[PDB]
Amino acid sequence: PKSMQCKVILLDGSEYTCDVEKRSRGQVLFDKVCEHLNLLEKDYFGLTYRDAENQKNWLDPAKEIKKQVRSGAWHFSFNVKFYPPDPAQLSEDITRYYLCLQLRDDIVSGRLPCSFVTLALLGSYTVQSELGDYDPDECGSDYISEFRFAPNHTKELEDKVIELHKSHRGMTPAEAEMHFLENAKKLSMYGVDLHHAKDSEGVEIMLGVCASGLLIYRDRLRINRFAWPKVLKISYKRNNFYIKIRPGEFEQFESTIGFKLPNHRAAKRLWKVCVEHHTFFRLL
Numbered sequence: 041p042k043s044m045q046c047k048v049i050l051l052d053g054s055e056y057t058c059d060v061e062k063r064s065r066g067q068v069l070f071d072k073v074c075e076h077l078n079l080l081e082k083d084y085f086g087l088t089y090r091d092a093e094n095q096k097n098w099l100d101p102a103k104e105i106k107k108q109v110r111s112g113a114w115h116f117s118f119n120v121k122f123y124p125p126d127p128a129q130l131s132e133d134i135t136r137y138y139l140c141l142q143l144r145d146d147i148v149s150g151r152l153p154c155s156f157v158t159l160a161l162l163g164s165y166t167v168q169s170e171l172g173d174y175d176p177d178e179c180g181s182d183y184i185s186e187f188r189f190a191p192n193h194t195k196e197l198e199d200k201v202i203e204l205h206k207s208h209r210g211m212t213p214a215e216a217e218m219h220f221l222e223n224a225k226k227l228s229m230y231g232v233d234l235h236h237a238k239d240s241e242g243v244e245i246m247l248g249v250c251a252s253g254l255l256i257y258r259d260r261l262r263i264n265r266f267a268w269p270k271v272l273k274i275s276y277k278r279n280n281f282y283i284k285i286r287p288g289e290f291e292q293f294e295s296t297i298g299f300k301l302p303n304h305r306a307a308k309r310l311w312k313v314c315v316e317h318h319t320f321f322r323l324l
């Protein structure tokens with residue numbers, strides 16, 4: 041029985057290596073990684089791989105791994121797929137811990153923009169969780185943490201993490217991670233998957249996929265949201281993506297809204313993540 045080596049980058053930056061039968065469906069590998077991580081609340085997570093165009097794709101757990109990675113290496117990342125709107129309602133602290141690790145990478149990477157003060161507050165909870173109570177013996181006036189808190193570090197930010205860290209004495213790791221998440225969940229880009237697109241007029245926009253629906257971003261002043269319940273049908277055709285909207289009260293007809301994606305793979309990818317969000321957050 042022939043086995044393929046899999047490598048998975050975990051959210052702590054370490055690498056998990058295992059073997060699966062070469063005809064294995066994604067669920068097989070996902071189950072191995074989740075067992076490694078001691079993770080029971082698996083529904084919020086998934087594996088990503090990079091396609092021949094170097095685009096991130098979700099590994100479909102129902103489909104053969106070989107038919108998704110195709111010509112590429114069996115190399116994956118473990119990621120949050122569905123960001124819970126209320127992390128306090130997760131059943132296990134360890135689920136919240138992995139969600140914190142994902143959000144820390146969202147922040148450092150710049151995918152999740154964040155004010156100075158919220159960067160310092162999130163950093164202070166991370167430090168409290170991982171090191172425990174503030175110790176002056178470990179930080180002089182010139183302290184620069186090993187912890188990565190932001191896309192760009194300043195001394196002022198390091199100073200502010202330390203000042204807030206002092207305020208958290210007595211806080212336990214689950215308690216600090218819960219505070220981290222109560223702040224992070226409020227950020228306007230929390231759990232938003234962004235896709236470059238053009239509107240039916242050719243104007244460059246971003247489409248955001250999240251718990252609360254499909255968002256449009258255009259020129260800042262020009263924003264729109266389609267809550268998932270309003271969306272009856274998601275479709276793609278060539279380089280185009282469509283949402284069918286329920287008729288409004290007293291309106292005769294449904295409405296279809298159309299967007300142009302970079303290419304056909306990008307339209308199919310946006311379609312699949314929307315359908316998945318629509319189903320997940322309909323049920324959650």
Ligand SMILES: CNCc1ccncc1
Nearest residue numbers: 047048049055115116117
């Ligand atoms: C040795 N590292 C290989 C790799 C694993 C996952 N993603 C990208 C590269």
